[PDB]
Amino acid sequence: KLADCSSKSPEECEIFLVEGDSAGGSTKSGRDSRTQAILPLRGKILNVEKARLDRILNNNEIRQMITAFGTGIGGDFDLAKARYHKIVIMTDADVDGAHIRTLLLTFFYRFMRPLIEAGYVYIAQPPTGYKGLGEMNADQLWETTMNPEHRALLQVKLEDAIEADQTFEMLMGDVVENRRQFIEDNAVYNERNITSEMRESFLDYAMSVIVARALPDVRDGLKPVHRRILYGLNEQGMTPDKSYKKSARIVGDVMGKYHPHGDSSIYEAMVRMAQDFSYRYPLVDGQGNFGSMDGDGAAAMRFTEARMTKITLELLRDINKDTIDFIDNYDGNEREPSVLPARFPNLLANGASGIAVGMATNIPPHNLTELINGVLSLSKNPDISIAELMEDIEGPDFPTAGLILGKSGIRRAYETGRGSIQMRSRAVIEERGGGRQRIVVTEIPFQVNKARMIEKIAELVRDKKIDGITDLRDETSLRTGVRVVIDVRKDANASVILNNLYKQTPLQTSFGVNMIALVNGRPKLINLKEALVHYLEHQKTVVRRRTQYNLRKAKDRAHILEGLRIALDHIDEIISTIRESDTDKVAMESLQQRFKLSEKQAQAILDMRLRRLTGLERDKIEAEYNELLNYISELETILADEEVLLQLVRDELTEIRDRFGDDRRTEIQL
Amino acid sequence: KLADCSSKSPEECEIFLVEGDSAGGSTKSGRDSRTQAILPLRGKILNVEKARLDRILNNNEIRQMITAFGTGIGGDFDLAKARYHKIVIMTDADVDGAHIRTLLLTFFYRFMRPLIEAGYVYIAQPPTGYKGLGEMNADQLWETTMNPEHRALLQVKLEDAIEADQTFEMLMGDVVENRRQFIEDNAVYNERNITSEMRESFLDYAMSVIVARALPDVRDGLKPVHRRILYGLNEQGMTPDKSYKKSARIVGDVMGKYHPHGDSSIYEAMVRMAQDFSYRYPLVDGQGNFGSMDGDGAAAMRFTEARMTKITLELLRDINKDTIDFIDNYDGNEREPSVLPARFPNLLANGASGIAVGMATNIPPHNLTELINGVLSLSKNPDISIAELMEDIEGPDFPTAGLILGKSGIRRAYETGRGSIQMRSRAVIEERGGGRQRIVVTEIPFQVNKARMIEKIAELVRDKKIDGITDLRDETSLRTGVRVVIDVRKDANASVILNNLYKQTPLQTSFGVNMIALVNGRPKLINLKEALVHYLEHQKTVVRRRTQYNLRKAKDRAHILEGLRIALDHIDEIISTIRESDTDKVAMESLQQRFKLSEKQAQAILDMRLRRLTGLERDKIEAEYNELLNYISELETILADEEVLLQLVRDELTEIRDRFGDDRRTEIQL
RNA sequence: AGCCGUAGGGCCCUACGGCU
RNA sequence: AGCCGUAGGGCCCUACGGC
Ligand SMILES: O=C1COc2ccc(CN[C@]34CC[C@](C[C@]5(O)Cn6c(=O)ccc7ncc(F)c5c76)(CC3)OC4)nc2N1
Numbered sequence A, B: 001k002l003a004d005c006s007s008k009s010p011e012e013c014e015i016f017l018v019e020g021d022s023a024g025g026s027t028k029s030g031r032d033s034r035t036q037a038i039l040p041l042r043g044k045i046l047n048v049e050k051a052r053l054d055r056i057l058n059n060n061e062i063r064q065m066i067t068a069f070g071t072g073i074g075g076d077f078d079l080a081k082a083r084y085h086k087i088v089i090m091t092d093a094d095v096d097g098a099h100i101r102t103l104l105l106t107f108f109y110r111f112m113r114p115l116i117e118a119g120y121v122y123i124a125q126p127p128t129g130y131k132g133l134g135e136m137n138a139d140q141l142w143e144t145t146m147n148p149e150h151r152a153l154l155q156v157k158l159e160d161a162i163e164a165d166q167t168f169e170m171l172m173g174d175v176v177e178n179r180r181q182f183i184e185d186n187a188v189y190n191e192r193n194i195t196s197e198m199r200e201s202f203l204d205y206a207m208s209v210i211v212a213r214a215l216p217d218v219r220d221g222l223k224p225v226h227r228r229i230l231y232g233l234n235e236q237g238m239t240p241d242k243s244y245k246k247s248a249r250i251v252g253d254v255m256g257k258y259h260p261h262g263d264s265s266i267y268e269a270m271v272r273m274a275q276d277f278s279y280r281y282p283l284v285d286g287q288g289n290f291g292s293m294d295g296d297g298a299a300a301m302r303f304t305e306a307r308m309t310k311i312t313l314e315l316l317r318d319i320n321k322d323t324i325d326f327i328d329n330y331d332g333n334e335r336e337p338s339v340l341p342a343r344f345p346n347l348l349a350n351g352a353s354g355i356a357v358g359m360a361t362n363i364p365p366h367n368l369t370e371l372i373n374g375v376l377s378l379s380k381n382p383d384i385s386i387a388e389l390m391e392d393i394e395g396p397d398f399p400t401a402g403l404i405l406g407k408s409g410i411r412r413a414y415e416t417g418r419g420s421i422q423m424r425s426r427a428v429i430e431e432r433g434g435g436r437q438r439i440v441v442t443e444i445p446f447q448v449n450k451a452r453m454i455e456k457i458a459e460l461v462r463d464k465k466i467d468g469i470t471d472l473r474d475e476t477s478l479r480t481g482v483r484v485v486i487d488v489r490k491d492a493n494a495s496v497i498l499n500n501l502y503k504q505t506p507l508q509t510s511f512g513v514n515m516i517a518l519v520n521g522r523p524k525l526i527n528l529k530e531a532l533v534h535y536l537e538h539q540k541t542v543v544r545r546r547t548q549y550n551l552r553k554a555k556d557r558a559h560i561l562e563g564l565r566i567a568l569d570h571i572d573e574i575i576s577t578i579r580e581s582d583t584d585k586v587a588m589e590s591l592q593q594r595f596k597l598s599e600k601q602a603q604a605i606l607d608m609r610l611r612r613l614t615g616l617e618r619d620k621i622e623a624e625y626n627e628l629l630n631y632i633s634e635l636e637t638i639l640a641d642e643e644v645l646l647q648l649v650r651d652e653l654t655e656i657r658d659r660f661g662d663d664r665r666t667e668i669q670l
Numbered sequence C: 001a002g003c004c005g006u007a008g009g010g011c012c013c014u015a016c017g018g019c020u
Numbered sequence D: 001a002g003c004c005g006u007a008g009g010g011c012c013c014u015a016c017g018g019c
């Protein structure tokens, strides 16, 4: 895949390392084919500091780079054989391109150390605000990054090798804690030194993954991709009353406007939100093949269609009533929400699963009715214990139902944010004829792949690791629901076979609770009370801001009426004033001075259509004015009393509990 | 890839053959897993009538069907070893689904005939307008086509065995003329016989590819995909004055609204429209990596950006002025143009190429100044000969320039619609020093891969197929342009080496002209005059319709201004009437009666804002009316005389020729 | 192990006609 | 023989943390 240069003189020859063919093309078009060679990689390169030699040497990209440089690796390294005196790292001008840069430096430091020592390793500086080099025109890439007469390359420099080994060990190694400690210690919410570069690039990547990718916000329970999808459907009015909309139109729109990442990242996030076995309260309503519990993926996006579910309307309720802060998108062309109003506690209701850098999050879904009664209880007692909260919130409530073994794990997770929860399958022992029996499984644990579990059981039988099993079939149908049958050998104790299946297969699975979520844009391990407290404050803020909006909005309307009232009373003198005016400006000025009107009032009059001059309009204006004055009072009453505001939040949460609250699916066996 | 059923009694067992995994997933979810198995294929299967036996037996999808059926092929076929007593073909409910069915039937007929004889082969009947089965929910696919209670299956019956043998060789064989004749003769503009199925399904497909895919319309020179891309850019304001819009937004929009096919087909058609080496007059203006002359493809659609070129504004000019006919899109939720106004001769300016069924198209690009001059000469003389047109139209004009050898092939092509055009590269012989020489190539033939051409020269040198070549280099760059160097051995005759390169390499390429375009939605082999006659007809129609639309609209606006003028003249009376009326209906009824106004006139007065009563606004109304009366008079002139209409078409083509007309690139050599 | 879910990145089989 | 351009269809490597 190497697009080598014509020359054979390494001293004048250069090799550019790009992320793939999309960047490679632009680079191949702009380059000097005489002295500049191109090697397109394939995205994220292997982390050699975490991988063993067998994996390193059987890797396609690693192999290709060694063959391109001709020096060999490690012990057998020979700088004389170097085919290029310039190895230039030209990854994309984004957080993931910085990660691939740290990955390439890691491989040059552990396998090609004298290449850095000779100053042969350089870092290209393409301009920011592109998605990739593939977004650049050939001419723009030459002049800014490739022309030796105008480019600015950073030559990689190695100073203290003890400091370098420690940095590559800390940032790239297998020990997560030291990496987590570096993020905590450093995170703030032409030649280059290899240590400073690794630390800066890796920190940009880690901070980006943590605050803007893998972890959900504590207020709305969403990760950036999900929030962008829901905001996307909302903006294009893809509400439940409207028809389904083409998946590609949704994905295309969201990619261009809010999410500058791969289509598959966007589309798979939309798919999961539509899966009744993934989401306890699904956020997307899908039409077509959206996958199954057997690991089957969704159909290609050209076949599927989607829209919002009714509960999603509750997450987006009052978004245009200045309840949430808006921010600029990635390119400054659009505005996006920083958080959603979230009228129901979505973090805990739907849960979250995220693998970040230096940490991970594993939050289980819960029952909406239980959560809401918990929030209601907390609003009535700020000093409520986790034990009192557990009277309302019994434990997680998986979409796939099943069983949880005791309150011990649950209790530990709700008090510390960490705990192991044993999930069991719903399995019964029934007779099948002729004095024979069978095990019937109708509920499997959360996130357990049904077909994969069936194969692990078959494996255990074929490899003689389990006694008593004659046959196993999957009888699942849309009619019957999940139905896995395991036939027992006549006279064999089916209960013994079942307990052996719980201990040796995904029939019994564990859920490692690790409640990490963003609190004030920062990752934080929180407990059940902390999570509810942050959600309750978000509601109080959203409701306060909605009331403040309406009040400003109602006071502006009342002021417009005061003026329209004045216009209808002095209609003939108003018309006369406009008629005798040469321009709009003169008319504005004259109406203001004569009738004691403001700029807005005069503008409202000038905008008034002739049909507003009808008989039942002065009565209409006065009817609206009076009702508005009542409404202004209702709003001022809420803002004056914090207890009234708090009751308003409770009332609205109670409506949501009655409209959306369903029964518990998962049995917590004591 | 087989998703087998629980049962092992073939007599009750059914095997469903689907297009791929998107359809497969809906099928796996909706089925009865006990008696129904699924075999997801991978799109179009091999054509066993045109393929050599060795290719058939090593083909992955063919192997998978034989393995699944467990019968064996041809002579080693055993109906006793049949794993299912029902082989159900369930392709998508579209033209390509019909093709895959004809492809499947052919393999069953030539390799597993007793399977048809036993009445084991069936045809499922999924509901029409979905794109794929993956667009449907499992329960919908179960009830409509998979449930034995409600389904309507067609059992394939083989009646006449001589008729079937002859049918399969006609539709699926290598002899095109038999297939072309069948299309021509048959084109129109529960048991089932295998011959009737093959004929209907093949005609479905063949017809679709001919009128709705592979052939350009004679009027706008576009194929459905190109037309839908350009219309998509117009309906999204993706004009040259505006900024580049993301390719993914364009793709998703076009696919969802007008083109029900793969995104690779839409994106690749848009890409080609943006390449200056493919389009004589590029239709798309691309930002980023849009591919090269070396066969390099464009960047993934998430990286690229695009908009209309200035020339495309001329293809779409006045589309929203009732110039062309709109039709319903594929699903009856959108409107799409049937043809574009096409203010310049696009078919001949950009050319076309497309492989259809029973026929193909191959039209070369031409120079815009020459084409317009040709149309102008034709407008002044309906009886003009091809030889006289050839005074204006010298011949094709490739974007990649080069040379054409003689007028003989050109003359034949313009007179019959068919001819062989000999194209040559622009190659010179020059000195390089020390008595030695080289061949410099600076222009290569049209649609020739530069890199592949170099490798062809390289392999001739290596395998000693050519003599005298010491070196071969691509010295091309953005700066220099195309530059290929072939170093000659000292004292060797370079012109001899050159003539040899022209005989043995793509350095000399023929262009087989085959002018097949859609004339009245029917494919026709047309010559030069016919192509321009149909273009001119279309322009006369567009400009007339535009004038007729502009007259209706101006007459509707003068009418509304007549009403507002009456109101400005009797303002106090108008106000009185509105003020006295209790409702908007009573006001409208009174104004119509009191001032002899129409319903439209009265509504316009009621909609009038107070700001229209000022001096400047009062004058605007009068000036617009006076401007409009002159415009109506100018429009009526155009419609009174046909020579004035034709002069307008001529003056509009002269404007376009002066603005877009450029120099000829391809040299026509005697 | 290798899986979970957001991210980086690309490749190859088929049909169809007319030219070589 | 195999390329040209709209069409049908889908796979597999990489990072990252916890168990
Ligand atoms: O924003 C929008 C709007 O409109 C759209 C409609 C449809 C689509 C889906 N298109 C695709 C789907 C898979 C794809 C990558 C792919 O080609 C698939 N694939 C395989 O299935 C198997 C092997 C393989 N090996 C290399 C390779 F590059 C690819 C492979 C190619 C097209 O990447 C994106 N995307 C958009 N995006």
Ligand SMILES: [Mn+2]
Pocket (backbone or CB within 6 Å): A019, A092, A096, A097, A131, A132, C008
């Ligand atoms: Mn990138």
Ligand SMILES: [Mn+2]
Pocket (backbone or CB within 6 Å): B019, B092, B096, B097, B131, B132, D008
């Ligand atoms: Mn299909």
